[PDB]
Each structure stands twice: as structure tokens, then as C-alpha cells.
Amino acid sequence: TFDDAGANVPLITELANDSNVQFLDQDDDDDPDTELYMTQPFACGTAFAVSVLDSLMSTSYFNDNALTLIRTLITGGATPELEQILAEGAGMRGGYCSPAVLANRDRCRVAQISLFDGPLAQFGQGGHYGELFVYALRHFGILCIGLYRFRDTNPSSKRYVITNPPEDFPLLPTDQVYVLTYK
Amino acid sequence: NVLKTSTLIRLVQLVVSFVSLWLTAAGFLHLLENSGDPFFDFGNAQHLTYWECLYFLMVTMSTVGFGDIFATTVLGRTFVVIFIMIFIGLFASFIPEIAEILGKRQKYGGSYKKERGKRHVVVCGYITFDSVSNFLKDFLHKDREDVDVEIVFLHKGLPGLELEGLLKRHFTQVEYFWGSVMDANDLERVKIQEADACLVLANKYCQDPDQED
Ligand SMILES: [K+]
Questions:
Q1: Binding residues of B for Ca(2+)
Q2: Where are the alpha helices (DSSP H) in chain A?
Q3: Does B184 touch chain A (CB under 8 A)?
Q4: Which residues does Mg(2+) bind (chain B) (predicted)?
């Protein structure tokens, strides 16, 4: 508890053994028969565990480019040139840069935005995900990939994640959107 | 996909391979004795039933060897010699391995049953004849008030013989279950939502008290 709190602190915790996730939370309504990916703490983005990486072996094989895509997003842009420069063992060589390389600072970034205010809030007021998607891409180049929504819309700050909603999927002004952006 | 478990796979391989070998060997001996020796123009023959052969092969696999029934064709006797060399190793390894597998089942499975309005206390952690007797000597002490609390032990081990005796002596009011408080199913088994209290006991003599705590 804190002066002018508590469970409102945003957490992410790595777990070595998946089934320990049951201890990580309360107001949980869980069953130990649930596999990790269905558990409330994982669905809220509070848990993470190395077991969810295992299909990176198989996906690696089925489409190599998909494994490059996940690396280009999650690393923020660790290209094989950087891996080579680190493999020289000199440490991460840097300094000022030429404009020719510094142009790459216009990469796309993963960002999160709120429908509570600003130009998109009109869709948060009872619109649908497809209306928002088409609008935001068209006016900002912002590409929307999912929602982050309170579990307790009727209470806690927990929010669950919705990958790729349908076109006619309803919106709330409390929703936050996972997006890809250039600014 | 019905053999879902490694022990159950091993069990069905053992039983079926043993029974199918015993039955087929009995058929072969039944053929030999009833047909007779071909190099004696089938004159030397002996009219066993299949069932007498099946019995006789069990009586020889086990090395019991009555000699109420025995082979008398030369092919029969040579088959019995081969059968002894092979199947003594089969029977003598099969019976212990079946006995281990059928001996593996957990005794203290099942679940506690809640009596009408009666209190119970779950007890867990370092459960042994020592810690349980030290506990129960005071907890059930005759100079306490006659309070009807039942004690429900919950631990991973099979109880040792001294503890099984103590549990049988207190059978009216003390219970034990295989399991751990780390599993929500075991907590449901002991109906801990409806327990009056839960006690967690420490191994005072452990190699690291920070690890035990
Ligand atoms: K004998």
C-alpha cells in the first residue's frame, strides 16, 4: 500500500514451471485441469513461461520468414549484422551515424492506444472493430491487430487480450488497441 | 488409444505374451503326443486332451513337476526339454513383474466424508509416526474437554507400520489420505473449505530450515 496502489501495479512474471500459475493470482475461478494458455493470468498478460516458445521449433521449419517476423518485432530490430558485430567480441560498437543508416529509425513499432479520448474515441462509443480498423489505417497508417479489455466490465483492473476481432465486433470507450505504427 | 499409461501398457504386454505363449505351447505338445513319433511310424503315441497339456505345461513352467502326466513321445520329451529351458525364465520373471505392477496401487486414495455438523482439522507437512504421536498425545489428551474434532492427515507418503497402527487405534476420529496441499484436487478430497482449521508441520531436524520454511 502507498501514500497519496497495491494490486494496480502492472506485473509480468516469468515462470519456470507452468502449473505454478495457479498460485500467481486470486479472484481466479480457475481449474487445475486448464492448460497454461487458457489460464486467467496468462490471458491477462501477467504470466509468461518458456513452454509457449516450444512451437518456435516447428514454426521455424514450416515457414522461416515467420520466425524472422517474430524476431523483427520482439527484438525491436536486432538484424544479423548486429549479431555479427557482437560476435567480433569487441562489445556493441556505436557512436554518431550517417543519415544513410539513421534512416532506419523509421521502423514500424508496436504500440498501444486508448479509445477513451482522442480522434478514435468515436468508435469506442459503441462502434465496431472494423469501423475503427478501416478508419485508423486510412488516416494514420495505424494497423490494428487486437484489443485489451477489462474482464470486469460490470472491480479489478485486469484486462484480457483479443487477437484479431471480427469486423462487426463491438467496442467500449475503456478498450485499448494493439497497433503497428510509424510515429 | 486405450492403453493410456506406461504401467498398464507393460501389464497387458506381460499378460497377453505369457498367456498366448502358454496356450500355443500346449497346442504344440498336444499335437506331438497325440500324433506320436513319426520315426516309429506313429506307433509311440499318447492321447492327452488339450487341457491336460495346458495343465502339464503350467506344472512344468512352475517347476512343480508332479509326474501325474508326462510326455512319452521322443518329440514330446525333446519339446519338454526345450520348453523347460525357455519358459522357466519367462514364468520366474513374469510372476514377480505382475506382482510388482498389481502391488503398485495406492492404498490411501479416496476422499473424506463430512459428518452432520462435526468439525475436522486438516494436518499436513512433516507427517510421521514421531510427529503424529507427539501431536496426537497432546491433541487428543484425555484431560482436554470432550470436543468432537476429527483429524485428517494429508501427505504424499504411504504411512509406516507404526503410524498405520496408531491410525487404526484412533480410527473413530483420525483419518489419513495420500496427496499434497499443493494440489487443489487433494484439498477438495479432504473438503478443506469445510475444515475448521489447517495445521502445517515442519521437519525441525531438516538439513536446511530456510528451505523447509
Ligand atoms: K519339482
A1: 143
A2: 40-43, 56-62, 64-74, 80-87, 99-102, 121-124, 129-140
A3: yes
A4: 115, 150, 175
Which chain B residue's Cα is nearest to A22?
B184
- Map grid coordinates 514451471 to a residue: A17
Kindly give the distance from the C-alpha atom of residue B170 to the centroid of ligand 1, in angstroms, as a whole number: 48
Length of chain B, in residues: 213
DSSP conformational letter for A50 = G
Residues, Cβ < 5 Å to ion ligand 1: B 65
**Look-up of cell digits 472494423:** A130
Q: Which residues of A touch B183 (CB under 8 A)?
A: 32
| B30-to-B70, B77, B82, B86 alpha-carbon distances in Å | 12, 12, 15, 18
A61 alpha carbon, distance to own chain's centre: 24
| Burial call B186-198: b when 16+ CB within 10 Å, e when fewer | bbebbebeebeeb
Which residues in chain B are closer than 8 Å to A22, comparing Cβ atoms? 184
Test A22 with B184 for CB contact under 8 angstroms: yes
Give the Cα-Cα-Cα angle B120, B125, B129 (nearest 5 degrees).
85
Alpha helices by DSSP H, listed for A16-75, are 40-43, 56-62, 64-74
DSSP letter string, B184-213:
HHHHHHTTGGG-SEEEEE--TT-S-HHHH-
Region for residue A118 given its phi and psi (left: phi exceeds 0; alpha: psi -120 to 50; beta: otherwise): left
- Residue A171, φ and ψ in degrees, nearest 5: -120, 150
Residue A33 assigned as binding residue: no
Beta strand B174-178 pairing with A13-15: unpaired
Please give the residue of chain B at the shortest CA–CA distance from A23: B182
Could you tell me which chain B residue has the CA closest to the CA of A32?
Answer: B184
Query: Could you tell me how far CA B28 lies from the centroid of its own chain?
Result: 34
Stated resolution in angstroms = 3.4
Nearest 10 degrees: Cα torsion B152, B158, B164, B167: 0
Q: Rounded to an integer, what distance in angstroms lies between the CA atom of residue B4 and that of residue B135?
A: 42
Kindly give, in sequence order, each residue whose CB lies less than 8 Å from that of residue A51, ignoring residues fewer than 6 positions away: A18, A36
How far is A10 from A139, CA to CA, in rounded Å? 31
